[PDB]
Amino acid sequence: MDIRPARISDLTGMQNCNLHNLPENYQLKYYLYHAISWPMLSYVATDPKGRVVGYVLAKMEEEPKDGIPHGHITSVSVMRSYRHLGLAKRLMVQSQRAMVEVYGAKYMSLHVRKSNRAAIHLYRDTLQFDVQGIESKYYADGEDAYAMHKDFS
């Protein structure tokens, strides 16, 4: 697989990947808003034909919680066929390094639904995130989110 920074021209393919894999979706405009606002934070995995097969869609907190700059994963997923390879872990490390070097992020945070065993085992155990707390009825269907938060230090 080929992991590399996201470009404008592969945003639609990030969207399509999101649509296939996650209940939480956005219109293309919101992807564009990520690209123009933080042009090097998002990464993408492509297949031999160049189409998007995994991604992380990252940003920096617009309204900084307590004045300290920090990153936010807003979405990450991989087509079912390319799972269990290391794609997500690798997409996550690339994106994190950029938050630090370009924006001076002192930490990053994300949301996972309480039952997503997969995502938890990825952040908590193999990317060393902490469970910050629990956000009641965060997803549209009412499921609770774990707020996860990794401190850079």
């Binding site: 999101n18 994963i73 979405s75 994300l110 949301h111 549209a140």
Partner: peptide, 4 residues
């Protein structure tokens, strides 16, 4: 993933 975040929910908007």
């Amino acid at each position: 993933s975040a929910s908007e």
